[PDB]
């Protein structure tokens, strides 16, 4: 065992040496001549009300119009952001919902939480009333995220340190990903839906191959847990935020961190991030009731979406880049522009 | 234009339902039931269940008031993430194994809960559920509480001690010493935003529900008074 650990330390040192060899220059120097974005003075344009308790997650529709929200009073609600009219009010079996999803074709939405079970709902039923269509079991820890590859495959990640791929039609785990030593928190599919990433509660991020069911790369550098993650639009980069009160940007080919976003005034932890359509603005949420705007290529801040009366716990951007939502333990969704 | 009437009709029907729900939601109290493994927690939970998956929910009502108690299960021991979900519960029951070094683990856990920021507004109830076992351990003499607790050597029964009939002075001394360790934690830095309610319990105490009922009522009254800025 001692020899194994020694030569493993040798491998880790070799990896660190290899990564260090590829760091010719800093990201800032390359973008040292990019003009500042300027003051992004965004303001609320709508306000959606009806939730009793806090809000954990929401997902946009593929048309940039419909969106679904999940709260801990046991309710899923599909709004029409153009007119703020409710369309459905879906009760839940387990009131501790910790995530939600919106199917690409717009027919299904899935949610799950401490119950460990990811449920599938149908929005195009013949009767017209949404009803359960498939309940997926097989995890042994609270489920913390879920996204749709298509109408027939949902990828789920849980707190027992394992991410799994499901075949909705049968309910079996076609594949299971392992290699994490802590809770897995957030993930996001690639633009092509070939690869996805997930950072866990060990300050590490791992890139996975969906087809082969095995880890492809590993990234480190954070000091504490990881709460949010997301792919850059081109699919060749992804930025992560941690409880250490910092955000960072990686690249799947550089195999190393390229930039960090930090400020001394910030002593709280991030809870959700997301990019813009052009991938030029890195939004983010914080525990101190604010949401910041980070100019991705310059490391600076360029705007604050203040207005929330409690922690921000979710965020997103429409597929066409028109509107941005936010949710909070205050129980109120806001639409900015 | 017909669609707008069709949609506006839909919204009204939905809003009628949510307002119907809102009333039901406020009439239910939520209680998280922590507890060490060897604490007899399951015994007290079964006691509540008889008289009236990653989580288990038990519903019971007292005096027409509805309490909703959630007991964790099938989770890993790393509590620092799925514990945030319980910031809005009315209270966090907490069973402890007094007679058991288990007790030090309970002290550290209680401190960690007390000083956490998201939970810095959720009052915690406290139970001590091995009084008979502690009494027999100390009475038998082969326990030597002094070795693990040197401070217990110079401790004396507090002036306000009220012992049950037939209770030996040594038993009372030990029992009340156990509690003092936690109260040192629960008094400092309290800030008056949340309190602790110690009790001495037994596995088969019928009135375990009554204590939590009264303490929930007290928490509600304190919150309301603080709202009006009286206390």
């Amino acid at each position: 065992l001692d020899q194994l650990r020694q030569e493993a330390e040798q491998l880790k040192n070799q990896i660190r040496d290899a990564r260090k060899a590829c760091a010719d220059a800093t990201l800032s120097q390359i973008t040292n001549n990019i003009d500042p974005v300027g003051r992004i003075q965004m303001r609320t344009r709508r306000t959606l009300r009806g939730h009793l308790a806090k809000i954990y997650a929401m997902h946009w529709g593929t048309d940039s119009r419909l969106l679904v929200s999940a709260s801990q009073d046991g309710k899923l609600i599909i709004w029409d952001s153009y007119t703020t009219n409710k369309v459905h009010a879906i009760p839940l079996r387990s009131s501790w919902v910790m995530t939600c999803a919106y199917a690409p074709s717009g027919n299904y939405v899935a949610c799950g939480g401490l119950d460990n079970i990811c449920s599938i709902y149908n929005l195009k039923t013949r009767e017209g009333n949404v009803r359960v269509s498939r309940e997926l079991a097989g995890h042994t820890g609270y489920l913390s995220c879920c996204r749709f590859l298509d109408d027939n495959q949902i990828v789920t990640s849980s707190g027992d340190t394992t991410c799994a791929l499901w075949d909705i039609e049968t309910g079996q785990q076609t594949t299971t990903f392992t290699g994490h030593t802590g809770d897995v928190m957030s993930l996001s599919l690639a633009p092509d839906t070939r690869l996805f990433v997930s950072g866990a509660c060990d300050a590490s991020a791992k890139l996975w191959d969906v087809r082969e069911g095995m880890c492809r790369q590993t990234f480190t550098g954070h000091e504490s847990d990881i709460n949010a993650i997301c792919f850059f639009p081109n699919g060749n980069a992804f930025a992560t935020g941690s409880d250490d009160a910092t955000c960072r940007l990686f690249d799947l080919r550089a195999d190393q961190e390229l930039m960090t976003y930090s400020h001394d005034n910030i002593i709280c932890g991030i809870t959700s991030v997301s990019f813009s359509k052009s991938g030029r603005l890195l939004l983010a949420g914080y525990d101190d009731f604010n949401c910041n705007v980070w100019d991705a290529l310059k490391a600076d801040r360029a705007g604050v979406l203040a207005g929330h009366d409690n922690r921000v716990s979710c965020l997103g951007v429409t597929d066409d880049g028109m509107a941005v939502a936010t949710g909070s333990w205050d129980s109120f969704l806001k639409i900015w522009n | 234009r017909n669609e707008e009437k069709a949609q506006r009709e839909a919204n009204k029907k939905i809003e009628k339902q949510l307002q119907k729900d809102k009333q039901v939601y406020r009439a239910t109290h939520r209680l998280l039931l922590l507890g060490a493994g060897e604490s007899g927690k399951n015994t007290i939970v079964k006691q509540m269940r008889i008289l009236h998956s990653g989580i288990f929910e038990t519903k019971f009502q007292v005096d027409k008031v509805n309490f909703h108690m959630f007991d964790v299960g099938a989770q890993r021991d790393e509590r620092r993430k799925w514990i945030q979900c319980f910031n809005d519960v009315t209270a966090i029951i907490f069973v402890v194994a007094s007679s058991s070094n288990r007790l030090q683990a309970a002290l550290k856990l209680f401190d960690s809960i007390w000083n956490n920021k998201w939970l810095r507004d959720t009052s915690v109830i406290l139970f001590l559920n091995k009084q008979d076992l502690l009494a027999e351990k100390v009475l038998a003499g082969k326990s030597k509480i002094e070795d693990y607790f040197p401070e217990f050597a110079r401790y004396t029964t507090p002036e306000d001690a009220t012992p049950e009939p037939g209770e030996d002075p040594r038993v009372t001394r030990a029992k009340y010493f156990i509690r003092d360790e936690f109260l040192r934690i629960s008094t400092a830095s309290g800030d008056g935003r949340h309190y602790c309610y110690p009790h001495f319990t037994c596995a088969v105490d019928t009135e375990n529900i009554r204590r939590v009922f009264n303490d929930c009522r007290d928490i509600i009254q304190r919150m309301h008074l603080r709202q009006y800025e009286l206390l």
């Epitope: 030593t181 802590g182 509660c201 060990d202 300050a203 000091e223 504490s224 847990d225 409880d243 250490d244 009160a245 002593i267 932890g269 | 890993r76 021991d77 790393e78 509590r79 620092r80 514990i83 683990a105 550290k108 401190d111 960690s112 809960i113 000083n115 956490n116 920021k117």
Partner: nanobody, 125 residues
Framework: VQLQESGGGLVQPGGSLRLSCAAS????????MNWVRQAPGKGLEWVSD????????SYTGSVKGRFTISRDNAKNTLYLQMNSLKPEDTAVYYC?????????????????????RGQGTQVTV
């Protein structure tokens, strides 16, 4: 997060020995630290923790007055001084860290599979 213990060895009962824990990979001053040991056939047991700057201290009752805790934030180190060992204290010592910075709570440091926990050194009497 890298934790590197050192200073173990063999000592006759009643002797003395010092444990020197070295750390790197994060801002040392911000994190509350602990010493936690594992004896054979026993679950993890807690010993002593010290605050960010050394203001506060604590011990488990059994080791009261025997050991001592101390840290040097200037040198990225944690220390433990032992005196008058007893036969029933043979165990491995895990230099430990609390998860989140700038906080006072230290959830689940003694967990079975904590992430920010050192490999540890052996001290036998």
């Amino acid at each position: 997060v890298q934790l590197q213990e050192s200073g173990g060895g063999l000592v006759q009962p009643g002797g003395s020995l010092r444990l020197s824990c070295a750390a790197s990979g994060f801002t040392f001053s911000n994190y509350k630290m602990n010493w936690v040991r594992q004896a054979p056939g026993k679950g993890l047991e807690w010993v002593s923790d010290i605050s960010q700057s050394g203001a506060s201290i604590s011990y488990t009752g059994s080791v009261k007055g025997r050991f001592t805790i101390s840290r040097d934030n200037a040198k990225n180190t944690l220390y433990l001084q032992m005196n008058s060992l007893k036969p029933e204290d043979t165990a491995v010592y895990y230099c430990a860290r609390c998860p989140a910075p700038f906080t006072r709570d230290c959830f689940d440091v003694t967990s079975t599979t904590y992430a920010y926990r050192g490999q540890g050194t052996q001290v036998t009497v």
